[PDB]
């Protein structure tokens, strides 16, 4: 495999893109650090919650590979906590290498719908959750003293824009931003920093009442409709593509890339 | 004067750019609506903060000129109080055109000192202050029915990157996002929202022990250096330098140009 | 005036952007070098070419606003007669301060129907044209001793893309990229080197049989039809829109800035 | 082997990057059709030319791996002889799914040295050669209706800039416009185009006298020493490092990646 030997902290493992991210690196022989929040997400966004028992499937799928697992229920929000459990992981499998901060919202409103709450939630989650899990995961890596390689999910969103979030938006950007610092200063101990881009992805981000929210935001603005035409006939990444650029970005097939901006997203960035 | 008869809302008003802004578009023809802190700044910020008198000789300067001016004491942070104040100052100079969110702070540091208060610190005052600013005043714009200009004041740092404010740097981003979301959503009320990125300017963000904070940061990774480095002779643009530009995108001679970035920075971003 | 005293070399100044640039630096009272080729285009441009009497008409015009004026029919293409005629114009106005690069063509294709002299034509007038502009006319900013502002005429689609002309946005993106270089170098003399990326502008390259020959490109890929789509209501801009952009590059107002990428495209670039 | 049944046609093929790909992807699984000039550069260029015997052992190389390839001595300016090896190569092999256009040319020259055919040279080669190559190669991916990528080979200059060529900056953007033109109307065919843009690869781009030409360019600005500065220790990169990328864009796993612009320098295009 792979990532043999390696040790990856991935958020929003749970389900999704980050339970993509888990199975995919325990497969190339990684053994894992995972988190969610596994509860209450907050009241802007429109899709239902991930559970204890999404989480527990993960730890499942990871051990059905043969892999050890340390997973922990945690809101990325919570330093203390999440800086804990990474201590707590890397005690347990003796190292750390990889970290994906992919733990993330979305929530389609209308920019005047947007309360000063709901900017500060999605702001918190999305950029401070990220900023929180480089700083528990990093001076690990930096220990080992063997390099590492840290991914932050951004959006499409965060390279070009995305319509009827200007939260969400304003927080990919900063993503993008967090990956260019933390290149920069983290470049030293060869540990590389990337964010990634995808476009829409086939996950529970679609569920309970996402459909209609997006329909909603859309008829405020019907001259912003086009933004994420792609130029494949793909509307829509599998989180197992997203799995393939990430896994890619973890392994030493990627050793020279740093602070780059990685977009899966069928082309739309540049639509 | 290019913007007779308008009404400018400028946030960071009490000194550096944010006076000249004041100054610079009195002088165009333009009434005032200014906003300061005047007051302590986070800890991690190293320079010195304005004061009450600092923000009244921003008044006597555009009461100088011949020109109306609405000034408090109030911070970006505070959404409620913001309003209040852009809500009167609109009711007394009878519209509003033009914002300019200037306020923000910088703060030298490294990496791995940047506490969870730091971070939150200068993401609340240079994001969530930012949104707060043109959530309090594009309603004022909109009611008007004329359309109207909205200005950014991201960096350098949110086109390319700075080293040494993980913060700073990501904050600067989110703000590139912002311009670019509220674009995109108040662009059908004909108004141009638009992010102005400056590398140094010649501002008392340069006061109390900033040369020291930089020189600190840089010593623990001289090979980031060079990042600021111009093309042109001069390594520090005049804040007159960044009204100019400002300037031109309140005015009505940039009516097409919405969503951009317009960098000030003697070509650094490209170097 | 912006430009008292000024001189300024343009080139595609016929008619369209060009003359409108000759009109307002003249307005702003600078003298004016003119060129402009009046005369027959690449086969694959499906637009009327410009005549002497067009570019008389700039002459004219020109001379209303009480100016000096140089001007002669010349291809941009025509390197050894582009630098005489500068040098003529210099020895007539004494110096030279602005470069205005906008002669340039556009030529709707499908991918498959760009033959290699339809992309070698396309090249040829939109980079190489370019390139010869600021080689014949920097030398002489450089021997004034005053520095100066070089403007390279791109496109949005040397910022993002547009569809259905391989050439012409890979002409478009190199203009980027001489920009960008020139700047770099040319900065130790204070010559500012930018670029600016116009969306749809109404002149004559916009005339019927172009909508005619952008219809039959687009009915070969209906998904690639909102790439223009902009943020404001309206999709074209004004030549007197683009003359106040470069207005205010050539002006000292915008003395520090270089290197930049100037949209005017009401958002288009971020759709 | 990520490319089992598949065929790559590689260009620049007798050395440096392009070996590296075409011996990368012969170990992958798929055959070759490889093409390099094999003979005279343009007369800016300072280093050596790569030999027939070059182009031998690469032949070599991929047999022994093995692998059918078909190789021929071509220059990529010429559109009718390179469609034609392609043509024999397809006819020979059975298909084509993957494009590596690679040949390229550098040349560092202060900008007042670059003479028109020098500027010519280096553009013909970069964009028209890159333009002919997947004219040449394309209508065979999409004659076997099975989709497939294309790879074009910028630099980092493509992206930021690179000083001392403005033509070879010029042109490596050109080829970040190829890149997003060629994705926007091939990708209904399942085809996905990207740029790569390595900083600095260890190869004999290096050799004759391409030290030297560097040192004198740079005695011209010194203020532009640093655009190339990494943000990890290592200022280089191998060609086996190129090929891990373009090895990446070939494969399955980037299956929802077009018109991106993948980094390969350490970070240096975000210092
Ligand atoms: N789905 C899309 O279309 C799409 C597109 C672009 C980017 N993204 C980004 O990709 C990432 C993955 O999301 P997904 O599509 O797998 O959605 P998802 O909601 O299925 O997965 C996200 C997971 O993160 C967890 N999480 C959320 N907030 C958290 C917090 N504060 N602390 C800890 N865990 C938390 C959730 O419980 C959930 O398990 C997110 O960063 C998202 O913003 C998604
Ligand atoms: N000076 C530089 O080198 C430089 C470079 C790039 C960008 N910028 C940005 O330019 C803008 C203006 O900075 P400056 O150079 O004039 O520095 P400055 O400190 O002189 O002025 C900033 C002003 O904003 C005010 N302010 C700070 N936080 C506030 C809050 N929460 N609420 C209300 N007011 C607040 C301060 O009191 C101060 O008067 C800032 O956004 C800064 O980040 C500065
Ligand atoms: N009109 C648009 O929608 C649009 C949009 C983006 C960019 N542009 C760019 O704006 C610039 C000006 O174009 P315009 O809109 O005024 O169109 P236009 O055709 O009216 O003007 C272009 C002028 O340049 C002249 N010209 C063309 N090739 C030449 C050559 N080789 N040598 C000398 N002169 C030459 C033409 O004769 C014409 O007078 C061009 O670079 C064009 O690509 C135009
Ligand atoms: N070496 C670097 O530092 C560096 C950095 C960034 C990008 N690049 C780019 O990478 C690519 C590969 O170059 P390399 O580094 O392997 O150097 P190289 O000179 O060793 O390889 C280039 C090969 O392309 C061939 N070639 C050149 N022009 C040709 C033409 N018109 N037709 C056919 N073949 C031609 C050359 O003969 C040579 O064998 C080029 O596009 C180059 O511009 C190189």
């Given at each position: 495999?792979?990532?043999?030997?390696?040790?990856?902290?991935?958020?929003?493992?749970?389900?999704?893109?980050?339970?993509?991210?888990?199975?995919?690196?325990?497969?190339?022989?990684?053994?894992?650090?995972?988190?969610?929040?596994?509860?209450?997400?907050?009241?802007?966004?429109?899709?239902?919650?991930?559970?204890?028992?999404?989480?527990?499937?993960?730890?499942?799928?990871?051990?059905?590979?043969?892999?050890?697992?340390?997973?922990?229920?945690?809101?990325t929000?919570?330093?203390?906590?999440?800086?804990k459990?990474?201590?707590?992981?890397?005690?347990?499998?003796?190292?750390?290498?990889?970290?994906?901060?992919?733990?993330?919202?979305?929530?389609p409103?209308?920019?005047?719908?947007?309360?000063?709450?709901?900017?500060?939630?999605?702001?918190?989650?999305?950029?401070?959750?990220?900023?929180?899990?480089?700083?528990?995961?990093?001076?690990r890596?930096?220990?080992?003293?063997?390099?590492?390689?840290?991914?932050?999910?951004?959006?499409?969103?965060?390279?070009?824009?995305?319509?009827?979030?200007?939260?969400?938006?304003?927080?990919?950007?900063?993503?993008?931003?967090?990956?260019?610092?933390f290149?920069?200063?983290?470049?030293?101990?060869?540990?590389?920093?990337?964010?990634?881009?995808?476009?829409?992805?086939?996950?529970?981000?679609?569920?309970?009442?996402?459909?209609?929210?997006?329909?909603?935001?859309?008829?405020?603005?019907?001259?912003?409709?086009?933004?994420?035409?792609?130029?494949?006939?793909?509307?829509?990444?599998?989180?197992?593509?997203?799995?393939?650029?990430?896994?890619?970005?973890?392994?030493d097939?990627?050793?020279?890339?740093?602070?780059?901006?990685?977009?899966?997203?069928?082309?739309?960035?540049?639509?």
């Amino acid at each position: 495999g792979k990532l043999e030997g390696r040790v990856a902290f991935i958020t929003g493992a749970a389900r999704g893109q980050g339970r993509a991210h888990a199975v995919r690196m325990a497969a190339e022989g990684a053994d894992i650090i995972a988190v969610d929040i596994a509860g209450k997400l907050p009241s802007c966004v429109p899709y239902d919650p991930a559970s204890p028992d999404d989480l527990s499937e993960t730890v499942r799928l990871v051990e059905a590979a043969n892999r050890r697992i340390v997973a922990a229920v945690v809101d990325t929000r919570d330093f203390d906590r999440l800086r804990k459990v990474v201590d707590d992981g890397v005690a347990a499998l003796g190292r750390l290498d990889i970290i994906v901060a992919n733990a993330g919202v979305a929530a389609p409103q209308a920019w005047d719908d947007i309360t000063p709450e709901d900017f500060r939630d999605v702001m918190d989650i999305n950029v401070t959750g990220t900023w929180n899990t480089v700083m528990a995961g990093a001076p690990r890596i930096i220990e080992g003293g063997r390099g590492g390689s840290i991914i932050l999910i951004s959006s499409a969103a965060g390279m070009k824009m995305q319509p009827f979030m200007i939260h969400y938006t304003a927080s990919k950007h900063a993503v993008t931003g967090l990956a260019r610092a933390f290149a920069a200063e983290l470049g030293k101990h060869s540990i590389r920093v990337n964010s990634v881009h995808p476009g829409p992805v086939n996950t529970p981000m679609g569920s309970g009442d996402m459909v209609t929210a997006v329909g909603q935001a859309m008829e405020t603005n019907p001259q912003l409709s086009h933004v994420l035409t792609p130029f494949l006939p793909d509307w829509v990444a599998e989180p197992e593509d997203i799995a393939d650029t990430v896994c890619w970005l973890a392994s030493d097939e990627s050793r020279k890339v740093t602070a780059a901006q990685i977009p899966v997203d069928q082309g739309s960035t540049q639509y």
